[PDB]
Design a protein around this ligand. Structure first.
Ligand SMILES: [Mg+2]
Ligand SMILES: [Mg+2]
Ligand SMILES: [Mg+2]
Ligand SMILES: [Mg+2]
Ligand SMILES: [Mg+2]
Ligand SMILES: [Mg+2]
Ligand SMILES: [Mg+2]
Ligand SMILES: [Mg+2]
Ligand SMILES: [Mg+2]
Ligand SMILES: [Mg+2]
Ligand SMILES: [Mg+2]
Ligand SMILES: [Mg+2]
Ligand SMILES: [Mg+2]
Ligand SMILES: [Mg+2]
Ligand SMILES: [Mg+2]
Ligand SMILES: [Mg+2]
Ligand SMILES: [Mg+2]
Ligand SMILES: [Mg+2]
Ligand SMILES: [Mg+2]
Ligand SMILES: [Mg+2]
Ligand SMILES: [Mg+2]
Ligand SMILES: [Mg+2]
Ligand SMILES: [Mg+2]
Ligand SMILES: [Mg+2]
Ligand SMILES: [Mg+2]
Ligand SMILES: [Mg+2]
Ligand SMILES: [Mg+2]
Ligand SMILES: [Mg+2]
Ligand SMILES: [Mg+2]
Ligand SMILES: [Mg+2]
Ligand SMILES: [Mg+2]
Ligand SMILES: [Mg+2]
Ligand SMILES: [Mg+2]
Ligand SMILES: [Mg+2]
Ligand SMILES: [Mg+2]
Ligand SMILES: [Mg+2]
Ligand SMILES: [Mg+2]
Ligand SMILES: [Mg+2]
Ligand SMILES: [Mg+2]
Ligand SMILES: [Mg+2]
Ligand SMILES: [Mg+2]
Ligand SMILES: [Mg+2]
Ligand SMILES: [Mg+2]
Ligand SMILES: [Mg+2]
Ligand SMILES: [Mg+2]
Ligand SMILES: [Mg+2]
Ligand SMILES: [Mg+2]
Ligand SMILES: [Mg+2]
Ligand SMILES: [Mg+2]
Ligand SMILES: [Mg+2]
Ligand SMILES: [Mg+2]
Ligand SMILES: [Mg+2]
Ligand SMILES: [Mg+2]
Ligand SMILES: [Mg+2]
Ligand SMILES: [Mg+2]
Ligand SMILES: [Mg+2]
Ligand SMILES: [Mg+2]
Ligand SMILES: [Mg+2]
Ligand SMILES: [Mg+2]
Ligand SMILES: [Mg+2]
Ligand SMILES: [Mg+2]
Ligand SMILES: [Mg+2]
Ligand SMILES: [Mg+2]
Ligand SMILES: [Mg+2]
Ligand SMILES: [Mg+2]
Ligand SMILES: [Mg+2]
Ligand SMILES: [Mg+2]
Ligand SMILES: [Mg+2]
Ligand SMILES: [Mg+2]
Ligand SMILES: [Mg+2]
Ligand SMILES: [Mg+2]
Ligand SMILES: [Mg+2]
Ligand SMILES: [Mg+2]
Ligand SMILES: [Mg+2]
Ligand SMILES: [Mg+2]
Ligand SMILES: [Mg+2]
Ligand SMILES: [Mg+2]
Ligand SMILES: [Mg+2]
Ligand SMILES: [Mg+2]
Ligand SMILES: [Mg+2]
Ligand SMILES: [Mg+2]
Ligand SMILES: [Mg+2]
Ligand SMILES: [Mg+2]
Lengths: 21, 122, 80, 199, 86
RNA sequence: UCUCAUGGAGAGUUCGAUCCUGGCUCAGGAUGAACGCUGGCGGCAUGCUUAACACAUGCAAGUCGGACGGGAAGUGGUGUUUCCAGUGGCGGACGGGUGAGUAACGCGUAAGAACCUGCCCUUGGGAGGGGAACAACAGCUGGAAACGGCUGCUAAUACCCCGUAGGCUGAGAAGCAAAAGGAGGAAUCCGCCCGAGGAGGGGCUCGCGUCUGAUUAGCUAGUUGGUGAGGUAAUAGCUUACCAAGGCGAUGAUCAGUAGCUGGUCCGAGAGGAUGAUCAGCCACACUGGGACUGAGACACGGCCCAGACUCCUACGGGAGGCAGCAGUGGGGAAUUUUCCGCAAUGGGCGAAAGCCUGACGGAGCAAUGCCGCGUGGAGGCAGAAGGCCCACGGGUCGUGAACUUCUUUUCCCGGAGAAGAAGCAAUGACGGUAUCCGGGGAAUAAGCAUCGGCUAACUCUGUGCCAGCAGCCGCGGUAAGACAGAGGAUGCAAGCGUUAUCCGGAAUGAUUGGGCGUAAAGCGUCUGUAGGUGGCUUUUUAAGUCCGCCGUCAAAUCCCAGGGCUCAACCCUGGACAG
């Protein structure tokens, strides 16, 4: 498996976690 | 006249009215002939003039003059019309560009050929 | 930040640059604060007005490589 | 973009045009039909004046027009400045230096890269000549031969005081800017300026 | 810049006044001068000013959805005080 | 007769004639133009104005292994070195496109005070002692796929706690708050936390300027202000409760209609009119509406959520998507280009650097769309011949024109060499073996298009007979048409020439400069009078207009002047300035 969307995805997840903090 | 009166906006221009409303700010428009027929000119010019009615893309219906000598146009033909007025015929404000789309060029015209849409003879 | 760089003027194939103090986020030819140097490869024409250069290097303007080395040749980094 | 048509013909209708033809016109032989247009409308007088100018220098209209704009701009007497500008053309200077038979000749001479202005080849007719300028032939056999034969076999020594010619290498030199009295034709620039009020 | 002098049309409200300022302008086309009159909500703490007053008008931060201007004592004006007659 | 001026043209048409008022029409410029005919080259530009209508395919934002745990390629193995999803770090808020909405502090200008600020400078101090998790991975498992679910497991520049703090709250007393390591053998480097500055980038507030409509006259109740509590990075009806009754409006509020705005562009003798493509600044928008989250910065074009409309995939249970990014397809249309090359230059992003990515950009291709340059030959050529056309048959004219003789080779053809653009270590060029330069042939490869009645430069003849047709306006055409069609001839422009559309001019025809109202269009039927405008003389005051000097600014580009560079010009570059 190989995933390419760094900008979108990674930033979206980060947004969740930081949001909960 | 009185300064105080001009300062109330007493000078207003008359705007420029177009001679060819049907074109709507275009060099030409394309249309389909609804009818092709002859009309008699206002006296004292007697003749039989070749006019078609054209329904345009801009939705209008107009009456366009057809120039030159003789023509092949018949109903449900697709032509190209341009502006300019035939002082003879009441209401006729548009010509039909010859040599384009469905109007062929005038046959056997040797002089001022570009006005009628004719090739140069070899 | 403020950057001292080249903006590209002149014509197709014949290129001539101005050296300008401008915020880094404006476009390459966009608006600027001050015009400073003049540069050109083909005429080998180069020169700068140093008072401005120094007044901007002082307030923390960062140059771009090409420009950096232009100021080097003209000895503006020594005075600094 | 050049007038390749019959020359004598334009000459019959305009007047005397040096930069065109050295052959004096035929007796004119119009004395049979005795056809005239009556006289000339003031407009036609003006028009023929401009045409005089235009064909003497082998300039196109759209060009002449831009000369005239340059003229109205310039600070000075308009007709005079115009005549200056037209008379400073490289081919025309090449002509009035006797380095050419006529202006189409001189023009051809320039086109084919046979001429030098200050040690550099200029092949375009309309190059404007400025004071202190060197007009040379290219050093090749052909260039020299052309210039020599057309210079020597034409006797005219009328050189108009702003133009120097020097003998063996054939260095021509442009000395200064033309004087209104030294101009290359009989023309009232007044008429031409007037014709051009509408552009 | 230069502050705007005017006269008070309304004192009724609290800590405020409504000033009218009259200025002359050279109308863009016709070159004659014209009186244009504009009204302002001026902030006046202490409510010292009454109706009819001639007051100078000053600029400060927003006090409200309207009042940006501080009401200020008449700046310089020709004394309506009688003067000698030599 | 010094100084200034470099600028203002008319013509036809009402009448049997005239003079006038008055319209229509023409001659000139300009296009993001289109169409017709014709088309050799180069230089610099330009290229969906209509449907902000739909979009098949491919590409347009990533980078860091020197934050970190892993596994996968090899190698003989952790000596070498690579890739890789994942957590973290900054960047995806710039750059690119469009002009739908917006008559507004949105834009231009000029002010202000209550703010914010990652990166970049400048500076003052610091970085103790612990602990807990979560992906990855592992195992089990659900799905056609898309994507999931359980249980374990683990590192950190990722989370949490405690100590200390020139800061924050507070009249005070007091109370409260921080950290992160990675490189290197060490020196040292890049970082980290807290203050305090700088510059730049944003947020707000206000004066002024910022379309048409009165056959749109009243509009507004958180509306206009006051207090108390909240809220915002900050001031504020920003919010909310109470109190008060204001605010705006005939100098046009509200409502309706149109429109992105400005440097500018086009036109004008000027005064000013019309417009807002390319180029540059600002605003607004991202399938149609609404939310927030993250973050220095977004209410976020190639992010999230929801609703809706539409397209696709599906093994039917469910998923996927947003070209008004570069190309490209359909469609609308009179009309607007290649599913191109390259990161070499400049500019960006990340990185210690090496470097990687950039449909920004740099270039090519297509198109006479426009502006500028050049060519299609130069010189001589019995005054004799063929032929067209006219002719009172004498001759005229196409016409020195061609044929013909010589010279020249820009352009064309065939060979050679061949750049600058690349920046100080060399190397590194998409353009391109292009621009340019040397040789060899050879007049050799290259002229059309309008008009010829007046305005308007240019005239005759044959064919037609109120017909066929022309025309911008007057008007031409019923047997000899200078107005139709053909011929010959001439005239104008020229690789373009015409026709149509659009705008300004001429138009003094909406008139400030610059008109009129006894009879031509035009004085309310007459007064009284409110707002509004103008208003006698003399002295003084003030200094708002007014005037003069000095300063700040009105971005660069454009226009104007003076030089310089592409062989010239267009175009580019430097310097400077009147206006206002
Ligand atoms: Mg007009
Ligand atoms: Mg160099
Ligand atoms: Mg040309
Ligand atoms: Mg001809
Ligand atoms: Mg050349
Ligand atoms: Mg004019
Ligand atoms: Mg009458
Ligand atoms: Mg009559
Ligand atoms: Mg009149
Ligand atoms: Mg015209
Ligand atoms: Mg063609
Ligand atoms: Mg569009
Ligand atoms: Mg696709
Ligand atoms: Mg790619
Ligand atoms: Mg590595
Ligand atoms: Mg790497
Ligand atoms: Mg690091
Ligand atoms: Mg190792
Ligand atoms: Mg990786
Ligand atoms: Mg953006
Ligand atoms: Mg942008
Ligand atoms: Mg663009
Ligand atoms: Mg403002
Ligand atoms: Mg604003
Ligand atoms: Mg306003
Ligand atoms: Mg940050
Ligand atoms: Mg610690
Ligand atoms: Mg603590
Ligand atoms: Mg190491
Ligand atoms: Mg170490
Ligand atoms: Mg406007
Ligand atoms: Mg309330
Ligand atoms: Mg709109
Ligand atoms: Mg005028
Ligand atoms: Mg566009
Ligand atoms: Mg733009
Ligand atoms: Mg769409
Ligand atoms: Mg936040
Ligand atoms: Mg937005
Ligand atoms: Mg984005
Ligand atoms: Mg997109
Ligand atoms: Mg596209
Ligand atoms: Mg199509
Ligand atoms: Mg179509
Ligand atoms: Mg590519
Ligand atoms: Mg690059
Ligand atoms: Mg770079
Ligand atoms: Mg960097
Ligand atoms: Mg490009
Ligand atoms: Mg071509
Ligand atoms: Mg071209
Ligand atoms: Mg071409
Ligand atoms: Mg064309
Ligand atoms: Mg086109
Ligand atoms: Mg000849
Ligand atoms: Mg040769
Ligand atoms: Mg090098
Ligand atoms: Mg050669
Ligand atoms: Mg005539
Ligand atoms: Mg005709
Ligand atoms: Mg016309
Ligand atoms: Mg008759
Ligand atoms: Mg007969
Ligand atoms: Mg006849
Ligand atoms: Mg006869
Ligand atoms: Mg005829
Ligand atoms: Mg003919
Ligand atoms: Mg006018
Ligand atoms: Mg008047
Ligand atoms: Mg009148
Ligand atoms: Mg009457
Ligand atoms: Mg009357
Ligand atoms: Mg009366
Ligand atoms: Mg009455
Ligand atoms: Mg009265
Ligand atoms: Mg009164
Ligand atoms: Mg008074
Ligand atoms: Mg008085
Ligand atoms: Mg400027
Ligand atoms: Mg100059
Ligand atoms: Mg030059
Ligand atoms: Mg300049
Ligand atoms: Mg000024």
């Amino acid at each position: 498996t190989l995933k390419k969307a760094d900008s979108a995805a990674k930033r979206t997840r980060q947004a969740e976690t930081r949001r909960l903090r | 006249p009185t300064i105080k009166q001009l300062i109330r906006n007493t000078r207003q221009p008359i705007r420029n009215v177009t001679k060819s409303p049907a074109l709507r700010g275009c060099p030409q428009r394309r249309g389909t002939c609804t009818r092709v027929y002859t009309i008699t000119p206002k006296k004292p010019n007697s003749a039989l003039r070749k006019v078609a009615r054209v329904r345009l893309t801009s939705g209008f219906e107009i009456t366009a003059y057809i120039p030159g000598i003789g023509h092949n146009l018949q109903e449900h033909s697709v032509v190209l019309v341009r502006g300019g007025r035939v002082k003879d015929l009441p209401g006729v404000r548009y010509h039909i560009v010859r040599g384009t789309l469905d109007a062929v060029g005038v046959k056997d015209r040797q002089q001022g050929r570009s006005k009628y849409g004719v090739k140069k003879p070899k | 930040m403020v950057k001292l760089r080249l903006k590209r003027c002149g014509r197709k194939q014949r290129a001539v640059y101005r050296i300008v103090a401008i915020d880094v986020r404006s476009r390459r030819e966009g608006r600027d604060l001050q015009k400073v140097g003049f540069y050109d490869p083909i005429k080998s024409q180069t020169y700068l007005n140093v008072p401005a250069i120094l007044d901007f290097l002082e307030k923390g303007a960062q140059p771009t490589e090409t420009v950096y080395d232009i100021l080097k040749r003209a000895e503006v980094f020594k005075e600094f | 973009s050049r007038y390749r048509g019959p020359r004598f013909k334009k000459i019959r209708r305009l007047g005397a045009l040096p930069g065109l033809t050295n052959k004096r016109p035929r007796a004119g032989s119009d004395l049979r039909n005795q056809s005239r247009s009556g006289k000339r409308s003031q407009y036609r007088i003006r028009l023929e004046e401009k045409q005089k100018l235009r064909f003497h220098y082998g300039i196109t209209e759209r060009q002449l027009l831009k000369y005239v704009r340059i003229a109205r701009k310039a600070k000075g007497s308009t007709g005079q400045v115009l005549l200056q500008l037209l008379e400073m053309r490289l081919d025309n200077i090449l002509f009035r230096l006797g380095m050419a038979p006529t202006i189409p000749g001189a023009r051809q001479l320039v086109n084919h890269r046979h001429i030098l202005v200050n040690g550099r080849i200029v092949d375009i007719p309309s190059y404007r000549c400025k004071p202190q300028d060197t007009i040379m032939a290219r050093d090749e056999q052909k260039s020299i031969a052309l210039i020599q034969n057309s210079l020597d076999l034409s006797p005219r020594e009328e050189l108009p005081k702003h133009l120097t010619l020097n003998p063996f290498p054939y260095k021509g030199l442009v000395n200064q800017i033309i004087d209104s009295k030294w101009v290359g034709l009989k023309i009232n620039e007044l008429l031409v300026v007037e014709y051009y009020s509408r552009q | 810049m230069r502050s705007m002098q005017g006269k008070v049309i309304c004192a009724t409200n609290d800590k405020t006044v409504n000033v009218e300022v009259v200025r002359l302008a050279p109308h863009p086309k016709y070159k004659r001068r014209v009186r244009k009159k504009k009204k302002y909500q001026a902030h006046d703490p202490d409510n010292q000013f009454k109706v009819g007053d001639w007051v100078q008008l000053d600029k400060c931060r927003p006090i409200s959805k309207t009042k940006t201007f501080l009401a200020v004592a008449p700046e310089g004006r020709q004394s309506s005080a009688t003067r000698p007659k030599p």
